[PDB]
From a paper:
CPAP and STIL are strictly required for centriole assembly: STIL at a very early stage and CPAP slightly later, possibly by controlling the organisation and length of the centriolar microtubules. Our mutational analysis of the interface demonstrates a remarkable correlation between the ability of mutant proteins to bind to one another in vitro and their ability to support centriole assembly in vivo, providing compelling support for our structural model of the metazoan CPAP–STIL complex. These data strongly suggest that the interaction between CPAP and STIL is a conserved, essential step in centriole biogenesis.
This conservation includes the contact made by the E792 residue in dCPAP (the equivalent of the E1235 residue in human CPAP that is mutated in MCPH). Although the overall sequence identity of the CPAP and STIL proteins between Drosophila and zebrafish is relatively low (∼22% and ∼13%, respectively), our structural analysis revealed that the interaction interface is conserved, confirming the previous proposal that fly Ana2 is the functional homologue of vertebrate STIL. Despite the many sequence changes between Drosophila Ana2 and vertebrate STIL, our work suggests that the interaction interface between Ana2/STIL and dSAS-4/CPAP TCP domain has been retained, highlighting its importance.
Author numbering: 11 to 24, 65 to 204
The structure:
C-alpha cells in the first residue's frame, strides 16, 4: 500500500495532513504526494498517487478499481475473485479464482484457457460464431456456425 502497482502488459495476439470536512468526508495528504479521499460513511475510498494513478475502493459494491495512468489501463477486482483488465484498444482480460483466463480481443474474438483438465489446450469463439477447440495431443475440433463439425487428427 501507499506505493503504486506495476503496470500490466496485454496478452499476445497469438507532514501527514488529515483534513476532515464539514459533512464528515476526509482528505489525507501524504508526504510522497499521495491524496487519500474517504467518503463521510467510510465506504468509498480513492487514493490519488503521485504518478497520476488512481485506486478506488467501493466497500458497498465490493470492488477495487485501479487506473494505470501511464498506460491508460483499468483493473477491477471483485469480491468473488474475478479480476478484469481493460486496455485502451478495447482488449479485456478476465481472470477467476479457479485459474480460468478469458481474453476479449478488439476484433470480437474470445480466447478461453484453463490449466485444469488440459484435455483441451485453448478454446476460441469468433465474431461470426465459429468455435475452435485446440487439444493437448495436437488435435482440433472446429464447430462452424452453419452446423459443420471439423475433427482434425494427427
Amino acid at each position: 500500500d501507499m506505493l503504486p502497482r506495476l503496470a500490466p502488459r496485454p496478452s499476445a495476439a497469438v507532514f501527514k495532513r488529515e483534513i476532515t470536512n464539514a459533512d464528515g468526508s476526509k482528505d489525507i495528504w501524504y508526504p510522497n504526494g499521495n491524496l487519500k479521499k474517504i467518503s463521510a460513511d467510510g465506504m468509498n475510498l480513492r487514493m490519488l498517487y503521485f504518478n497520476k494513478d488512481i485506486k478506488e475502493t467501493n466497500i458497498r459494491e465490493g470492488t477495487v478499481k485501479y487506473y494505470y495512468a501511464e498506460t491508460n489501463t483499468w483493473h477491477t477486482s471483485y469480491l468473488d475473485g474475478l479480476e478484469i483488465l481493460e486496455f485502451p484498444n478495447g482488449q479485456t482480460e478476465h481472470r477467476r479464482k479457479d485459474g480460468t483466463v478469458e481474453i476479449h480481443f478488439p476484433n470480437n474474438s474470445i480466447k478461453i484457457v484453463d490449466p485444469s483438465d488440459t484435455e483441451k489446450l485453448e478454446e476460441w469463439r469468433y465474431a461470426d460464431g465459429t468455435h475452435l477447440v485446440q487439444l493437448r495431443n495436437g488435435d482440433k475440433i472446429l464447430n462452424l456456425p452453419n452446423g459443420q463439425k471439423e475433427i482434425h487428427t494427427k
